[PDB]
Amino acid sequence: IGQAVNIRSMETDIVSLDDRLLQAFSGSAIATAVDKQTITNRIEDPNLVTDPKELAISQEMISDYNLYVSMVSTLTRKGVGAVETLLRS
Amino acid sequence: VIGQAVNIRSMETDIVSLDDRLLQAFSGSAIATAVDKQTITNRIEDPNLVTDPKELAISQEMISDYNLYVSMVSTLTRKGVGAVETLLRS
Amino acid sequence: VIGQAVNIRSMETDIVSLDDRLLQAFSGSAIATAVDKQTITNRIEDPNLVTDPKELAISQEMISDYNLYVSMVSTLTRKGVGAVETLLRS
Amino acid sequence: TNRIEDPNLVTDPKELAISQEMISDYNLYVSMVSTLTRKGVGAVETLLRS
Amino acid sequence: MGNDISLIALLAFSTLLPFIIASGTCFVKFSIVFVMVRNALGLQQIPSNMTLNGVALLLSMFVMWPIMHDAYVYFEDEDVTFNDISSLSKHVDEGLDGYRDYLIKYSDRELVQFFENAQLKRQYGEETETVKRDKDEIEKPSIFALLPAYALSEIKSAFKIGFYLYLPFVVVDLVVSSVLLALGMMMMSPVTISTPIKLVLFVALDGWTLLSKGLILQYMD
Amino acid sequence: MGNDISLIALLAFSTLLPFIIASGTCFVKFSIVFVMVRNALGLQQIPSNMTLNGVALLLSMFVMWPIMHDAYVYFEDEDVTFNDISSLSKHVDEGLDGYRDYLIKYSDRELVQFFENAQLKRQYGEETETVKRDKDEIEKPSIFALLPAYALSEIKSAFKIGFYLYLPFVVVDLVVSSVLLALGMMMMSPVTISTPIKLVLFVALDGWTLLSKGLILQYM
Amino acid sequence: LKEPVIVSKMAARKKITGNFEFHDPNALLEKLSLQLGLIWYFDGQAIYIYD
Amino acid sequence: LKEPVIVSKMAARKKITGNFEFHDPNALLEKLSLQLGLIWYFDGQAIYIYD
Amino acid sequence: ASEMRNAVVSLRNVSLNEFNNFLKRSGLYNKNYPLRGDNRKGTFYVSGPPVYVDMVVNAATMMDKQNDGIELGRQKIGVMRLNNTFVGDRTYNLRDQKMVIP
Amino acid sequence: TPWSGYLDDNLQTQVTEALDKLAAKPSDPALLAAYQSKLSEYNLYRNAQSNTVKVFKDIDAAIIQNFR
Amino acid sequence: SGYLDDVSAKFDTGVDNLQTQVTEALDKLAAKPSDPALLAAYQSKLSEYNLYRNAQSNTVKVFKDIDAAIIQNFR
Amino acid sequence: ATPWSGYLDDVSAKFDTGVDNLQTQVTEALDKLAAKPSDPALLAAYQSKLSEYNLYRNAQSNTVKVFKDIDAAIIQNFR
Amino acid sequence: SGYLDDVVDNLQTQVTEALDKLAAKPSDPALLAAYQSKLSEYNLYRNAQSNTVKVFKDIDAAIIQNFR
Amino acid sequence: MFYALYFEIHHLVASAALGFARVAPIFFFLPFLNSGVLSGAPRNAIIILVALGVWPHALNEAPPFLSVAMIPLVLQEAAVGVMLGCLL
Numbered sequence A: 001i002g003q004a005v006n007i008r009s010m011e012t013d014i015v016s017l018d019d020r021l022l023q024a025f026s027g028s029a030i031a032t033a034v035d036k037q038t039i040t041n042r043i044e045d046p047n048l049v050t051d052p053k054e055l056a057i058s059q060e061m062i063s064d065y066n067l068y069v070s071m072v073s074t075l076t077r078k079g080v081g082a083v084e085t086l087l088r089s
Numbered sequence B, C: 001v002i003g004q005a006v007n008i009r010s011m012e013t014d015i016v017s018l019d020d021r022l023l024q025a026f027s028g029s030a031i032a033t034a035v036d037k038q039t040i041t042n043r044i045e046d047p048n049l050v051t052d053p054k055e056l057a058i059s060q061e062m063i064s065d066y067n068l069y070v071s072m073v074s075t076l077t078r079k080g081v082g083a084v085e086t087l088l089r090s
Numbered sequence D: 001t002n003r004i005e006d007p008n009l010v011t012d013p014k015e016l017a018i019s020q021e022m023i024s025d026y027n028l029y030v031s032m033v034s035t036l037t038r039k040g041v042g043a044v045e046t047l048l049r050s
Numbered sequence E: 001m002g003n004d005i006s007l008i009a010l011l012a013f014s015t016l017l018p019f020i021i022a023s024g025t026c027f028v029k030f031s032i033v034f035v036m037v038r039n040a041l042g043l044q045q046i047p048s049n050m051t052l053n054g055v056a057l058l059l060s061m062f063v064m065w066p067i068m069h070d071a072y073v074y075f076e077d078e079d080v081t082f083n084d085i086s087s088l089s090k091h092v093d094e095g096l097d098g099y100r101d102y103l104i105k106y107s108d109r110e111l112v113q114f115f116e117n118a119q120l121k122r123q124y125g126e127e128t129e130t131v132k133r134d135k136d137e138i139e140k141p142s143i144f145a146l147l148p149a150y151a152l153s154e155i156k157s158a159f160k161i162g163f164y165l166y167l168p169f170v171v172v173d174l175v176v177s178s179v180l181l182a183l184g185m186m187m188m189s190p191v192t193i194s195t196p197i198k199l200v201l202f203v204a205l206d207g208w209t210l211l212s213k214g215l216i217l218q219y220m221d
Numbered sequence F: 001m002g003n004d005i006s007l008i009a010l011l012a013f014s015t016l017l018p019f020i021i022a023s024g025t026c027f028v029k030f031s032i033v034f035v036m037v038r039n040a041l042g043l044q045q046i047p048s049n050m051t052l053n054g055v056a057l058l059l060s061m062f063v064m065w066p067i068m069h070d071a072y073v074y075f076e077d078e079d080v081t082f083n084d085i086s087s088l089s090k091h092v093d094e095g096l097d098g099y100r101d102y103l104i105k106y107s108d109r110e111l112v113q114f115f116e117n118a119q120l121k122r123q124y125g126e127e128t129e130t131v132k133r134d135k136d137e138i139e140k141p142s143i144f145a146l147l148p149a150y151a152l153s154e155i156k157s158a159f160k161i162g163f164y165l166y167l168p169f170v171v172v173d174l175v176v177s178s179v180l181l182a183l184g185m186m187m188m189s190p191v192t193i194s195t196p197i198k199l200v201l202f203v204a205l206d207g208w209t210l211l212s213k214g215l216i217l218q219y220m
Numbered sequence G, H: 001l002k003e004p005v006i007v008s009k010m011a012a013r014k015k016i017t018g019n020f021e022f023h024d025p026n027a028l029l030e031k032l033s034l035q036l037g038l039i040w041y042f043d044g045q046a047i048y049i050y051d
Numbered sequence I: 001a002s003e004m005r006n007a008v009v010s011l012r013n014v015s016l017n018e019f020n021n022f023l024k025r026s027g028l029y030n031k032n033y034p035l036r037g038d039n040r041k042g043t044f045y046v047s048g049p050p051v052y053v054d055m056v057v058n059a060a061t062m063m064d065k066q067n068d069g070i071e072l073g074r075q076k077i078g079v080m081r082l083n084n085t086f087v088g089d090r091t092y093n094l095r096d097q098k099m100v101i102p
Numbered sequence J: 001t002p003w004s005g006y007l008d009d010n011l012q013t014q015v016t017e018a019l020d021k022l023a024a025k026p027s028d029p030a031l032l033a034a035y036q037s038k039l040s041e042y043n044l045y046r047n048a049q050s051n052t053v054k055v056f057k058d059i060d061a062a063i064i065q066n067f068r
Numbered sequence K: 001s002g003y004l005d006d007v008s009a010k011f012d013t014g015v016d017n018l019q020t021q022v023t024e025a026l027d028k029l030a031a032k033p034s035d036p037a038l039l040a041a042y043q044s045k046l047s048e049y050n051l052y053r054n055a056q057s058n059t060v061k062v063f064k065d066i067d068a069a070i071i072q073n074f075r
Numbered sequence L: 001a002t003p004w005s006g007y008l009d010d011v012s013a014k015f016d017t018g019v020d021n022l023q024t025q026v027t028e029a030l031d032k033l034a035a036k037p038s039d040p041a042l043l044a045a046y047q048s049k050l051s052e053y054n055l056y057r058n059a060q061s062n063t064v065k066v067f068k069d070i071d072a073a074i075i076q077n078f079r
Numbered sequence M: 001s002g003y004l005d006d007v008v009d010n011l012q013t014q015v016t017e018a019l020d021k022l023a024a025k026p027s028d029p030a031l032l033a034a035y036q037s038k039l040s041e042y043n044l045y046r047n048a049q050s051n052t053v054k055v056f057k058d059i060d061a062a063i064i065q066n067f068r
Numbered sequence N: 001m002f003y004a005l006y007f008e009i010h011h012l013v014a015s016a017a018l019g020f021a022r023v024a025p026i027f028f029f030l031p032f033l034n035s036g037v038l039s040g041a042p043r044n045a046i047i048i049l050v051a052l053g054v055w056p057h058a059l060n061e062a063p064p065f066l067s068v069a070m071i072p073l074v075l076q077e078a079a080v081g082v083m084l085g086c087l088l
């Protein structure tokens, strides 16, 4: 049990369009990197891969990860898909 | 049979704009859905309901109906927007 | 052998519009299907029919035939629609 | 075939393997004619504009 | 759904829907009138087709919505209504009269009669008496015969409307050309001068208001 | 992923997005104005439509950004409790008012009101005395009434701007024709003499900067 | 009548003119129901009128 | 006839001209059937005429 | 004023008046928008400004959930002496039959 | 789910009852012979039911997935 | 009708009378449950029945799966 | 006529998460049995509890699996 | 067939014949063991045929679409 | 006979396809039909409907041309359509 939280993380005002990207990109890449790591070290630990109460947690974590990355991919593709049609047309 | 209600009269179309009828349809569907998901989840935890053969035969039907309902709506909406794409992009 | 009937000279001096040919086909199929589903369910409910080998061996064939029929109608319909799309679509 | 032999042979695996060939080939033939006519008309329009 | 064939038919219909809108709804007419206006002003690429088709589809929604809603509640209606093949085929057929009444109300009687007779002569043979229903109650004609008559009727009337709108700009063009020849500037391309006069004329008329009003009032009393 | 019917609604909206931009945003106007500049200068193929549309799309984002930000934080960031049809309907509707107000700022009232009455379809053919040209409002018209009135207003505004832009270049070439007829040289077309003059006039005016600035200033 | 009245979208298309006396509304309502072709009901809280 | 009459769409395309009595309809109806090429049935509630 | 919120709450473990005491100690109570219901039962209606409604609904739901950890049913033991009879069961071996009195 | 507009539990109680009789005297051969039959029939009933409900789900899903 | 019923029937026209014999032997045995002569016959008939019904059902299952594969490859 | 909407207990479930009685009781029964593996009264109890725990855990896993396939199938329907 | 029109034996026959022989005596191990392998070989043949017909049609459909 | 409706739909689309070759050139010449006016998704939908409205034979029986080389035939029909477009 060793835990830390970073609290003063984000600015809520209206801000230039360039930086909303950097801040979204960075926060997302960080979240996915740590999520993936915790998944793998839940499988490598023998006390967690063999307990039926723990496996049920790992199942949810894996599924949530799958869905989150599927959705960020889909919406980004439709985002650039709009621009390319307005410009080509 | 424990508690039930029904809505008897639907408001006249003569006083409601075209987009109100949409908001009103959407909201009703989104709520009936969240309520069904919750109901199923609660049936899976009451130890009396999760271990009685009589009750399981009900849970299996409830989950099959939820699955078909959401697959239906998600298909027809995709066909609906595909029509607009076909007419405008073309 | 029970209650057999056949129409004769169906097309010999009258021809239906396609508009009607589709409609008769749809109706004749949809009702036969709904009656077969009820027959199956009833053969499952009756305590004397789900416990006798002779009656179970009959019910297995009914379920097999229903499943094959509905799958064939669905596949042919989808394939035939596809061709009209490839014709009309610019 | 209209009211001779029998209908509904959805079920015998030997005739059901003969129907697969026909049901496919006629769909391909009809699909091909649709393209050839567009090509022909397009060639005429191309020459007449130019 | 309570029945599987009822589902298959619904997915087929939802797969062919756009062509029915493209060929059997006022969209076919609005789309033409706006392109005619753009031709009249002598423009090439602006407004874009995507913008003109956008407004054309929105305006078509106000006109078609009531019969689509009517058909929807008619087929949802939960009260017991049919029992057997003849009652089902009549129930389905009866559900389409809300839309046959629409096609018939705007199709040209002469075209409807032509496409009907030419089907009778296919099915029953050309020796069957040519009907000449000159005073007529057209006996619920088949929708495959009724639909192309509507399509050509809307094309006719849209062209007709588009003609009227040219005549002011035609005047503008011939006038400008005459005054330039009166000055002898034979080498001046008139289009450079006449384009802005057309634009300011149309803006002073407020064309899009008048036009979008009248186009809708033609479909409702 | 929350409620999945809200997920379906989000993906649908995301698919229709380019047509909404193409018909309910000032992109409509900027796209037309820049092309008319090219026609008034009489150039047939340069700059590319790829370039002109890219610029118009960029500029319009500055104007629309303040609204999308507010809608986002209102819907997605705030967790809220709601429990029934009426509470949800009202909650959803209230989020759109930020956009609704923009449309009503740039749309023309009698046309919006006509479309409203057309979609109620009530008692129709209501007369001009059913209206009295009122001035100050707490009405909330439908968005399906507001979108086309907006489109049809923006287009007319663009045409008006295009009227003024043509005039100086029209003067520039009738002068050239008159000088060539003062000489004997009536066999020669003005165009090859006239084009460079128009290009210098336009650069001396720096028309691109005045245009972009003034187009933005209308929406501030 | 002392009751709120709800009129169907269809019945609201009809028009009327003249000088009327609402002396006994239940009776007048019954009268005009048949002349104009309406139908009506009363649940105890409001009066609903249809074509 | 004292019974409602239903005529099929196809049979409704024929035309007739002249001056008729209808004195004994059941007999007349039969005679006309064979001249025009019609067939007809009677269930007890309505008379159905077809080509 | 058009922003007023209203909600129905149902509690299983806590009485309405018990919740009132919580609000009063908190210094959150507001006599313009008081709770309406049966002091003795667990169901009530509340309406008011957004902040107040949300806080009430959350607080009450958490109170009710936490009281699933409390217990009421403490057993008690009674010791009762019999004054007129023997506590135990008896068996009478009749020379012909064994018979039992419980 | 009803097809809109179309015109057109005892075994559980019986097994419960037989169980209650048996529980009172587990050594009676007649109560044992009866319970064996009731329990066997109930078992077969529940299995046949749940297999059929799955077969219908899978046909509806295949139909949708064909046009989806 | 159908081919899968044709396959099912090709068994029932194969075992002419077994369906009757089994019930008849059961009635006899039930009349005198302790006769070894009866018992010995019933054991045989019952076994022959159990086997017939299992072979029939597994064959119908296999031909059903062959057809369900072909109707998918129609697509 | 239409069925009622229902009403949504939005807050309750997500913070109703907490240590289940059922696992606690399973581990307690096992610890009682392991002290005297030959007592029939304890064996009879543990058979029942372990069985119920098996059923519960399977039913839950299969349900989570079903609910997430629907969401993956929606997203794959629109991309 | 008995017929040729002018202008060995296959698994389809052998299966029908072995089923026909088996159904006369469903409890003989020689016949059962002779039938298992014919029904297996017929299942494999009838799958492999359909899968390759499907491949050749998808090739031709892709060609026509590529020249659209 | 089970597949007869499926084949009957394919006979329909083969007839419409061979009719398009003769009807579309007319739509090219006339001043109220050319693509300066009628364009996008309506265009094909309308041409096909007209061609089916005028095809001379019952739509539900097999097309007679299945035995013939397709190109000479398509060119023949397009030439006929061009001649009619001129005369109209």
Ligand SMILES: CCCCCCCCCCCC[N+](C)(C)[O-]
Residues within 6 Å of the ligand: F172, F175, F197, F200, F201, F204
């Ligand atoms: C037909 C007369 C054309 C004269 C030039 C028109 C103005 C543009 C070019 C000169 C601009 C003045 N400047 C900046 C050089 O001083």
